[PDB]
């Protein structure tokens, strides 16, 4: 079966690491950080990796029941699955699907419904992926809210991510850190079944990132979010499951108003994109541009300069 990539443009697509639209393409030099995300990881033949699932609205969300923590405004959530069934902390995944893959503080809203009378309550809440109480692989996390007396027990509760927050008396832009993985089992275990780290295996080649801007909710946060594959390509590769004729597919970026090729890049079977460039570059593209698969190539194909 012939391999293809969707003909959607960058503005039409969605980030695979947070439920927000894409914005621009960006290439930058890897080094001083390890590119090892667990969302947006998917092979070209349809195999999902890490914490990747298919719905773009279930990224960075949580479901389950809550419990008030004595004398605080904090709540502990016992995690369920997406379909509200029980979560199995013995599944061969790093954490429940859609769980964040970066260290930071995520602000959103906790909502709850009482199955009895159909009454509802919602409160702003914050979750910090970098503290001791963030143990999603164990099924339990913590929320900081504004109320100490409104969320009931044994009821379905859902966390909906909105943005990121930075708390501090200075130290600006020190969080979130998109290339630092959380400890999915807290201080009581090492992460397991992770998606492999990715890096170009070719000097002068850099990764191409699909970049969106996360909303900020408090302070001076880092709102840039790079992903390896748009959520739409993750969905495409899964449905098509076209076998790879090689370890590297060659894509071309086309401006259909002219018919002209703007640049070419390598789509690696493992599920990420490389360009031939040196230094950080915010790519400037026509809004109609789309990627196009041309041919499968070998290990030693040399790319035209982006």
């Amino acid at each position, epitope marked *: 079966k012939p391999f293809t990539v969707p003909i959607l443009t960058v503005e039409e697509m969605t980030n695979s690491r947070f439920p927000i639209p894409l914005e621009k393409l960006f290439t930058g030099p890897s*080094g*001083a950080f390890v590119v090892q995300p667990q969302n947006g990881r998917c092979t070209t033949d349809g195999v999902l990796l890490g914490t990747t699932q298919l719905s773009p609205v279930n990224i960075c969300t949580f479901r389950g029941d809550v419990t008030h923590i004595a004398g605080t405004h904090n709540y502990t959530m016992n995690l369920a699955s997406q379909n509200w069934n029980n979560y199995d902390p013995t599944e061969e995944i790093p954490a429940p699907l859609g769980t964040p893959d970066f260290v930071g503080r995520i602000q959103g809203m906790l909502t709850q419904t009482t199955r009895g009378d159909g009454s509802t309550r919602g409160h702003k809440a914050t979750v910090s992926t970098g503290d001791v109480h963030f143990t999603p692989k164990l099924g339990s996390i913590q929320f900081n809210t504004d109320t100490n007396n409104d969320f009931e027990t044994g009821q379905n509760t859902k966390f909906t991510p909105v943005g990121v927050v930075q708390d501090g008396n200075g130290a600006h832009q020190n969080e*979130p850190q998109q290339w630092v993985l959380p400890s999915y089992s807290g201080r009581t275990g090492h992460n397991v079944h992770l998606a492999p780290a990715v890096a170009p295996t070719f000097p002068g080649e850099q990764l191409l990132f699909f970049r969106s801007t996360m909303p900020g909710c408090s302070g001076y946060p880092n709102m*840039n979010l790079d992903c390896l594959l748009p959520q739409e390509w993750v969905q495409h590769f899964y449905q098509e499951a076209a076998p790879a004729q090689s370890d590297v597919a060659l894509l071309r970026f086309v401006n259909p108003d002219t018919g002209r090729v703007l640049f070419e890049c390598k789509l690696h079977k493992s599920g990420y994109v490389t360009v031939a460039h040196t*230094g*950080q*570059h*915010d790519l400037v593209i026509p809004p109609n541009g789309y990627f196009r698969f041309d041919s499968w190539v070998n290990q030693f194909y040399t790319l035209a300069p982006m």
Partner: antibody, heavy 126, light 109 residues
Framework: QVQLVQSGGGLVQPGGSLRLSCAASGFAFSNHGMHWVRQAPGKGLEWLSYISGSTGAIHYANSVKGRFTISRDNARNSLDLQMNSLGDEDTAVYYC???????????????????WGQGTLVSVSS | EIVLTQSPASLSLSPGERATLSCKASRSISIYLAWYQQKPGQAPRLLIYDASYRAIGIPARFSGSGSGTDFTLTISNLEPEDFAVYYCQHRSSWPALTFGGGTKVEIKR
């Protein structure tokens, strides 16, 4: 209350060796890469060396490769520059500058050094 | 490596006037160009990062613009303290830093 305080330098006879040091306080040291930069008197800045916070990535300018050695001890919040086989081309003020404010783990690989050292003069005269 | 030329090397302006410094790059470096200020005897001071974002604690009289190759630092109303030397800097050859030749802002009398 972020601070970079340098030590070392001084006078050296042509051919000799020196050791520079930068002591850091007020931030997560292993989260930021550090540079060494020199400014000969009256001229412009010149990049010398870089070492990254956690990845142990090390890079040197072409003029100093083989002669200089950069190093950091993240446990003691220190940064060292071993300078061997100096000459008068190496007479300058030497600065340690951090990559900031955004940590390495944010992927930012652009030009931004928000906190430097105070300066440490190195003179190579006989 | 990519080269950064500032021009001119010297500027003479009256306090209160408006300073316009230029940095030009040999080829494109997108928006990743930072401006520094150096008063003599001191270490450099970061004014502008990403070509147009003021660093933290910088007065609004400093404005940066540009992209690709042609970049411009602008001081709206020159104060007596803003007479120093000004370096542009890029980092396209990661990790190395490359600076410009500097531009000196002299007091005009």
């Amino acid at each position: 209350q972020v601070q970079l305080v340098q030590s070392g330098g001084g006078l050296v006879q042509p051919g000799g060796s020196l050791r520079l040091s930068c002591a850091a306080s007020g931030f997560a040291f292993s989260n930021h890469g550090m540079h060494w930069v020199r400014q000969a008197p009256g001229k412009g800045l010149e990049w010398l060396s870089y070492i990254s916070g956690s990845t142990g990535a090390i890079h040197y300018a072409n003029s100093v490769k083989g002669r200089f050695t950069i190093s950091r001890d993240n446990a003691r919040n220190s940064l060292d520059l071993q300078m061997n086989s100096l000459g008068d081309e190496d007479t300058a003020v030497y600065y340690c500058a951090r990559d900031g404010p955004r940590p390495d783990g944010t992927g930012y690989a652009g030009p931004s050094n928000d906190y430097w050292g105070q300066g440490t003069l190195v003179s190579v005269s006989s | 490596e990519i080269v950064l030329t500032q021009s001119p090397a010297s500027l003479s302006l009256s306090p209160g006037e408006r300073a316009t410094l230029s940095c030009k790059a040999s080829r494109s470096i997108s928006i990743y160009l930072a401006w520094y200020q150096q008063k003599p005897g001191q270490a450099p001071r970061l004014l502008i990062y990403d070509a147009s974002y003021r660093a933290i604690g910088i007065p609004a009289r400093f404005s940066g613009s540009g992209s690709g190759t042609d970049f411009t630092l602008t001081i709206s109303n020159l104060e007596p303290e803003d007479f120093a030397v000004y370096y542009c800097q890029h980092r396209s050859s990661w990790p190395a830093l490359t600076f410009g030749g500097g531009t000196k802002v002299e007091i005009k009398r």
